[PDB]
Amino acid sequence: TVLCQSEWLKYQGKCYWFSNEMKSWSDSYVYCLERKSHLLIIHDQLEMAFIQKNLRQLNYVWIGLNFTSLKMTWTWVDGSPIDSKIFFIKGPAKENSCAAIKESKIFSETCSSVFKWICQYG
Amino acid sequence: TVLCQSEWLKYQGKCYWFSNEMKSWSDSYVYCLERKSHLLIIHDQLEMAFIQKNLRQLNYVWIGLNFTSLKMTWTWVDGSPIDSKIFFIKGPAKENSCAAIKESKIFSETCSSVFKWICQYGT
């Protein structure tokens, strides 16, 4: 009894929007921000499961994770750095590296490549 | 009586941040949004004046205006379309056209070019 914006999915008191269009990580992020939400932050394994049920493999999907290179680790859009236990990222940790889900792995891709994305809010 | 974030300028109840770094219009917009603000919306001529006082000319500066091409007009980031009376824009009205101030004129540029920008928020 706390309603999601119409056409969003509700899961554990968060609301999710999975895109059909594709865009740069920045453009995706703008999309979410303008809609009072952010790119998807995965809190735990069970949430990972939920995301995976709503995703085609063979499709890079931007998530709210990127390579800072101030603290020189990957941080979520939260500002919390990634748990190297829970998550492993395949690919280079350069600047202008952003994370995407593909085949149930997280990949480093360049921020300017144009993928589907997921929005999330609480 | 209501204070601006440190190192922002106050003018008529709005706060302005003028960048030193440069980035794409989208990247700039993200920068503003993350800071609970938006790219600069010019309300009137007097505000135009204020902006111009704080800009070195011969420098493109992204502003919060772009070419929709759903309503097929320029709209501010507000969502209000351009007043062809108050403002004139030099340059093509293609998709992926965003507005930038240079030399106190507004130019259409492509969204991917990498300029200084201004953030703004109200009170």
Ligand SMILES: *[C@@H]1O[C@H](CO)[C@@H](O)[C@H](O)[C@H]1NC(C)=O
């Ligand atoms: C990466 O993450 C933050 C959001 O946490 C964003 O401010 C920053 O601009 C991002 N980098 C790129 C290359 O877009």
Ligand SMILES: *[C@@H]1O[C@H](CO)[C@@H](O)[C@H](O)[C@H]1NC(C)=O
């Ligand atoms: C242009 O304007 C809107 C702001 O309301 C924003 O959705 C959009 O991402 C920007 N689009 C372009 C052309 O970059």
